[PDB]
Amino acid sequence: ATSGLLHTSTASDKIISGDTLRQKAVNLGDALDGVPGIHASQYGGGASAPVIRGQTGRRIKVLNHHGETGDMADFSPDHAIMVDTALSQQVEILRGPVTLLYSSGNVAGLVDVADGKIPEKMPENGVSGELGLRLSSGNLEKLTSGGINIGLGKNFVLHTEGLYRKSGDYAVPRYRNLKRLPDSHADSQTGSIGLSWVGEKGFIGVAYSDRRDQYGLPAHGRPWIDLRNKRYELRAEWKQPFPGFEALRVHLNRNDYRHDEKAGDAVENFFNNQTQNARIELRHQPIGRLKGSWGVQYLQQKSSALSAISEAVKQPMLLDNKVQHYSFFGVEQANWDNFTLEGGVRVEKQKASIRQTARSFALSGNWYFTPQHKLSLTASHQERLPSTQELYAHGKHVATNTFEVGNKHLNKERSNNIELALGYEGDRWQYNLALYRNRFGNYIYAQTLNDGRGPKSEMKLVRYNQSGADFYGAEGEIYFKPTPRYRIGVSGDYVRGRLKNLPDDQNAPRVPAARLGFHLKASLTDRIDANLDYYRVFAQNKLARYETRTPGHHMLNLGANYRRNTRYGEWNWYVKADNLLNQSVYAHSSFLSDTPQMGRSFTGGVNVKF
Ligand SMILES: [Zn+2]
Numbered sequence: 001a002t003s004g005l006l007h008t009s010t011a012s013d014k015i016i017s018g019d020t021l022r023q024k025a026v027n028l029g030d031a032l033d034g035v036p037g038i039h040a041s042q043y044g045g046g047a048s049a050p051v052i053r054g055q056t057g058r059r060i061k062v063l064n065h066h067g068e069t070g071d072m073a074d075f076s077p078d079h080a081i082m083v084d085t086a087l088s089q090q091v092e093i094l095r096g097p098v099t100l101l102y103s104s105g106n107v108a109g110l111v112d113v114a115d116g117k118i119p120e121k122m123p124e125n126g127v128s129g130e131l132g133l134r135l136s137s138g139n140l141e142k143l144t145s146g147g148i149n150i151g152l153g154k155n156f157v158l159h160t161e162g163l164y165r166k167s168g169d170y171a172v173p174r175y176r177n178l179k180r181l182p183d184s185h186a187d188s189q190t191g192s193i194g195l196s197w198v199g200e201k202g203f204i205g206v207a208y209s210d211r212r213d214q215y216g217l218p219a220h221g222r223p224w225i226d227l228r229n230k231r232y233e234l235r236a237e238w239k240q241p242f243p244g245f246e247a248l249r250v251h252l253n254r255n256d257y258r259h260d261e262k263a264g265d266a267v268e269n270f271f272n273n274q275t276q277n278a279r280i281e282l283r284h285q286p287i288g289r290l291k292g293s294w295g296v297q298y299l300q301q302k303s304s305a306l307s308a309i310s311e312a313v314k315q316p317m318l319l320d321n322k323v324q325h326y327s328f329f330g331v332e333q334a335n336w337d338n339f340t341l342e343g344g345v346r347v348e349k350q351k352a353s354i355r356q357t358a359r360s361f362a363l364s365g366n367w368y369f370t371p372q373h374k375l376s377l378t379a380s381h382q383e384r385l386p387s388t389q390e391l392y393a394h395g396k397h398v399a400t401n402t403f404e405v406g407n408k409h410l411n412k413e414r415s416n417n418i419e420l421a422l423g424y425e426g427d428r429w430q431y432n433l434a435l436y437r438n439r440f441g442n443y444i445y446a447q448t449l450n451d452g453r454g455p456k457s458e459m460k461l462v463r464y465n466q467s468g469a470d471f472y473g474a475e476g477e478i479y480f481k482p483t484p485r486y487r488i489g490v491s492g493d494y495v496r497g498r499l500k501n502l503p504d505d506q507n508a509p510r511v512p513a514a515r516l517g518f519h520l521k522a523s524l525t526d527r528i529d530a531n532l533d534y535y536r537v538f539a540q541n542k543l544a545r546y547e548t549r550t551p552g553h554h555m556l557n558l559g560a561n562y563r564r565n566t567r568y569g570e571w572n573w574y575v576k577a578d579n580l581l582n583q584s585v586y587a588h589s590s591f592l593s594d595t596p597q598m599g600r601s602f603t604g605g606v607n608v609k610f
C-alpha cells in the first residue's frame with residue numbers, strides 16, 4: 001500500500017496487480033467491475049464512474065498517486081476520470097482512517113491509482129519499463145500502451161510514457177434493429193514525462209502529463225465530448241528529514257482540466273477546472289511501538305462551466321468560483337502485539353470566493369488471532385462540505401439533458417458510519433467477508449422534480465434537497481483451492497438503501513443490483529494461466545422516486561494468459577472473451593439504464609515487460 005505514508009491496512013483493503021490491469025478494460029469503472037462491492041456507472045465507451053457500495057461522485061474519492069485528479073468526474077458520470085489504468089503500476093482500494101488523510105465524506109472507500117510518472121528508484125540494468133498492444137473484436141479497440149525509464153547518469157532517472165486508444169461504435173445484442181450502438185465511439189491518447197532523483201536519502205521528482213480524449217454521447221450533428229488535461233506535478237520523499245521523524249513527504253500539483261460538450265463542431269457547454277493542490281505529509285518516530293503521521297494540505301480549485309449564451313443574458317449553470325481548502329489532518333496507530341488500533345482526524349476550512357469549518361474523525365480496531373486471520377471493526381464520523389455545484393446550480397447540461405437546480409440554504413453532510421469485516425487465507429481455504437452500514441443525518445441528493453415555477457427521455461429537472469438516509473449491505477468472496485496449481489471460488493455482494501424523514505420512507509436514487517459470482521483459474525502449466533468467471537446479476541425490484549425496472553442478466557467471461565521469459569525482459573500474451581451468452585446487459589447504477597452495454601466481444605493482446 002503506497003497511498004498511506006503510515007501503513008494502516010485493514011481486512012477490507014485489496015490490491016490488484018498491474019499485469020492483470022493490462023488485460024482488463026481501460027476505463028476505471030468498467031475495468032474494476034467484477035471485484036465484489038464496486039459496480040460500473042458506464043456512460044458509453046468514454047467514461048465510467050466506480051460505484052463503491054452504491055456510492056459515487058464526492059462520496060467516493062479517486063487519487064492520481066497521492067494527489068487530486070483535478071477532474072470533473074464527480075460532477076456527473078459522463079465526464080472522464082483523469083487516471084491511467086494501463087500505465088499504472090498497481091491499483092489499490094482502501095478503507096479506514098487513511099480516507100481522512102486526503103478527503104472528507106469518503107464513506108465508501110478510497111481508490112488511489114499509483115502511476116510510474118516519477119521512478120523513485122534507479123532502474124535495474126540502467127533502463128526499465130514496459131510496452132503493450134491489444135485489439136478488441138466488435139468494439140473495435142486499438143490500444144497501444146508504453147512506458148520507459150532511463151538512467152540519466154548516476155542518480156538522475158528520466159521517464160517517458162505513452163498511450164493511444166481508438167474504439168468505434170460497440171456492438172449491442174437484440175437492441176431494436178442495430179448492429180452497433182450509435183454515438184458510442186471513444187478515441188483517446190495519454191502521454192507523460194518525468195525527471196527524478198534517487199536516494200539515499202530519497203527522491204526529488206517533477207512530472208508533466210498530457211491527455212486528450214474524444215468520445216460520443218449515447219442517449220441525447222452528433223453529441224460528443226472533446227477534453228484536454230495538462231498536469232504540472234512535483235513529488236518528493238526521503239527517510240531522514242530531521243531528528244524525531246521517520247519520513248518527510250511532499251506532493252505539489254497543478255492540474256489544468258477542460259472539456260467541451262459539443263454537437264458536431266460547435267460548443268454548447270464549456271467546462272474548466274484550474275486545480276493546484278499542495279500537501280506536506282510527515283511520519284514521526286515510533287514512540288514505543290505506536291506509530292503516527294501528521295500533515296497539512298492547501299488546495300485551490302478555480303472551476304467554472306459556461307454555455308454558448310453570454311453571461312449578460314442568462315445565468316450560467318456553474319458561474320466562475322474560487323474554492324480554497326485549508327486542511328489539517330493526521331493519523332495514529334497503536335500496535336499492541338496482536339491488535340492494531342488506529343484513529344484518524346481531519347479539519348479543513350473552506351473559502352468560497354466569487355466560511356464553515358469541516359471536522360471529520362475515525363476510529364478502527366483490528367484483531368489478529370493468527371495471521372493471516374484478520375477481524376476488523378471500523379467507525380467514522382465524517383463531515384463533507386457541499387460543493388459549488390450543489391449550491392449554485394441554475395442551468396442545463398446537454399450531455400445528460402437535465403436542468404440542474406441548487407439551493408442557497410443547505411447544511412453540511414454529516415454521516416455516522418460503521419462497518420466490520422473478517423478475512424482469512426492459508427493455502428487450502430481463503431475468504432474475505434465484510435458488512436457495512438451507513439447512517440446519514442444529512443444526505444444531499446438530486447431530487448427529481450416536479451413543478452415548480454413553470455412550465456418545464458426528454459428534459460429532466462432536478463433540485464439538490466436535504467434528507468436523512470440509511471444504507472446497509474453485505475459483500476465478500478471465498479476461494480477453495482483443492483491444489484495450488486488450480487483455483488476455484490465463489491463471490492457475492494448485496495446493497496440496500498432508503499431515505500427517511502423528509503423536511504415518506506422511499507428508496508435511494510440508483511442503487512446497484514445484487515451480483516453473485518462464480519470464479520475459476522487453472523494454471524497448467526507454469527506459463528499458461530487459464531480462467532473463467534460467471535457473474536450472475538439479479539434484477540433490482542426496489543426502485544427510487546422516478547425510476548424503472550432493470551434486469552437481471554447472466555454474464556460470462558473467459559480468459560487465457562501466457563507468460564514467456566525471452567531476451568529483453570518478459571513477454572505477456574493474453575486472450576480474453578467477454579459475454580459468450582450475449583445477454584442484454586442493463587446497468588441501473590449508470591445513468592444510461594435503458595441503453596444496453598456491449599454484448600459479445602473478444603480480446604487479444606501482448607505486453608512486453610522489462
Ligand atoms: Zn508518492
Ligand SMILES: [Zn+2]
Pocket residue numbers: 315394
Ligand atoms: Zn434564476
Ligand SMILES: [Zn+2]
Pocket residue numbers: 076078079261397399400
Ligand atoms: Zn457534462
